[PDB]
């Protein structure tokens, strides 16, 4: 019998700073045990300082991004070129996903950008439209590997202040763009070591008030 879904592998990662936000994703694309492409981007600039990635089944992923990109376009036409805020984009995406509740897009979606106070924002979705704003989110095949590392290093979970008898927690603070990119690169190299569907290359999209910058890094090709 025909099976309409497939698994294209890979993994994605979003981190928010004080005045910036990053959305990273590996450039590998696979089916079963074969590599389809070593460089197939899945993190996209969607305009209005919103970056998006829908990792899982690439056909559904591309379809969704394509529809959201189109949603942004028609938002400008219908509302006098108004900038789509990150919170508004997130709610719009929920309706796109939930629209296919009974024949879902097999993707874990993450968007990143700046909120209306100019502060870094990461939103993340389940396949059918459930969403939540966070400082931190990993998605995709290697999400189970990367996410707990982020809890530890971004939100300082399970870390206490030395010599305080485990009574005072390590204080929360924003990370610099330099420190965030370090965590991203280490997250992906670690994931590449232990997950077969992750590797080849890493592409990071950084979002500041100035615009959207890109950075590329090699990953292990085995």
């Amino acid at each position: 019998q025909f099976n309409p879904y497939g698994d294209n592998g890979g993994t994605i990662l979003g981190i928010a700073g004080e005045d910036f936000a990053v959305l990273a994703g590996d450039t590998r694309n696979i089916t079963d045990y074969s590599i389809n492409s070593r460089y197939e981007p899945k993190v996209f600039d969607c305009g209005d300082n919103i970056v998006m990635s829908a990792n899982g089944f690439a056909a559904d992923g591309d379809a969704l991004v394509k529809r959201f990109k189109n949603s942004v376009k028609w938002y400008h036409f219908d509302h006098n070129d108004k900038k789509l805020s990150i919170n508004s984009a997130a709610r719009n995406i929920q309706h796109l996903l939930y629209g296919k509740r009974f024949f879902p897009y097999y993707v874990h979606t993450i968007i990143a950008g700046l909120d209306e106070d100019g502060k870094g924002a990461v939103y993340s979705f389940d396949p059918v439209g459930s969403y939540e704003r966070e400082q931190c989110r990993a998605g995709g095949a290697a999400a189970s590997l990367i996410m707990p590392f982020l809890d530890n290093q971004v939100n300082f979970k399970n870390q206490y202040e030395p010599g305080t008898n485990g009574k005072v927690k390590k204080p929360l603070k924003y990370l610099s763009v330099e420190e965030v990119i370090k965590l991203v690169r280490d997250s992906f190299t670690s994931a590449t070591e232990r997950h077969i569907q992750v590797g080849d290359g890493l592409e990071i999209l950084i979002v500041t008030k100035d615009g959207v910058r890109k950075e590329f890094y090699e990953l292990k090709r085995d």
Binding site: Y98, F102, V128, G129, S130, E132
Partner: protein
């Protein structure tokens, strides 16, 4: 999920956990399971995350349209029945929703309505809904009285979620407290189980099963 809400002398207490699951994977620890429909209406949610989130946000829109059309805030009964009639249309399609529409109006007084995705709609004084409802019921029922103070009632709701957060593997993260009075709902803060458990253990002398 574990969610509860109970009626008492001083209004309604509403308490929920904050964990989301994808099987045995902990998807989140910081999820909002109380939707604020209006200053006098709250909706707890349990079940499918998207179904709950989507349809309760939708419910709020229908309640807003009611007060625009009728120049009057919607009743708790009418609000709960909009949602129950909606899910009933989808009966069999596979929606998963366990909600408790809690609020106050002049004609009704403090009212709680249990509504779920297979069409059941029940008015009542006490309800616990979710994977850890039984754990919450155990603590809540054994300590419940109508004459509880606002201070004691708030704590009992908090302590009941904590109990379930501990035992139920699919509940935890943190406790979100609310108190509904004649003047509307009042938020009583987010309480992380990471600190709350040990605070309760030490002060109350409970949780002797755990290695202190």
């Amino acid at each position: 999920t574990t969610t509860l809400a109970f009626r008492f002398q001083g209004g309604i207490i509403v308490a929920v956990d904050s964990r989301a699951t994808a099987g045995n994977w902990v998807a989140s620890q910081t999820v909002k399971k109380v939707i604020e429909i209006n200053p006098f209406l709250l909706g707890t949610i349990a079940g499918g995350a998207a179904d709950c989130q989507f349809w309760e946000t939708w419910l709020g829109s229908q309640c807003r349209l009611h007060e625009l059309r009728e120049k009057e805030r919607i009743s708790v009964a009418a609000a709960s029945k909009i949602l129950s009639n909606l899910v009933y249309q989808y009966k069999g399609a596979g929606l998963s929703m366990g909600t408790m529409i809690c609020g106050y109006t002049r004609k009704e007084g403090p009212t709680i309505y249990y509504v779920d995705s297979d069409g059941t709609r029940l008015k009542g004084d006490i309800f616990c809904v979710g994977s850890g409802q039984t754990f919450a019921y155990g603590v809540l029922d054994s300590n419940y009285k109508w004459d509880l103070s606002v201070e004691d009632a708030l704590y009992l709701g908090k302590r009941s979620i904590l109990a379930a957060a501990h035992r139920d593997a699919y509940s935890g993260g943190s406790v979100n407290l609310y108190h509904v009075t004649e003047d509307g709902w009042i938020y009583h803060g987010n309480h992380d189980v990471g600190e709350l458990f040990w605070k309760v253990k030490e002060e109350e002398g409970s949780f002797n099963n755990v290695i202190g």
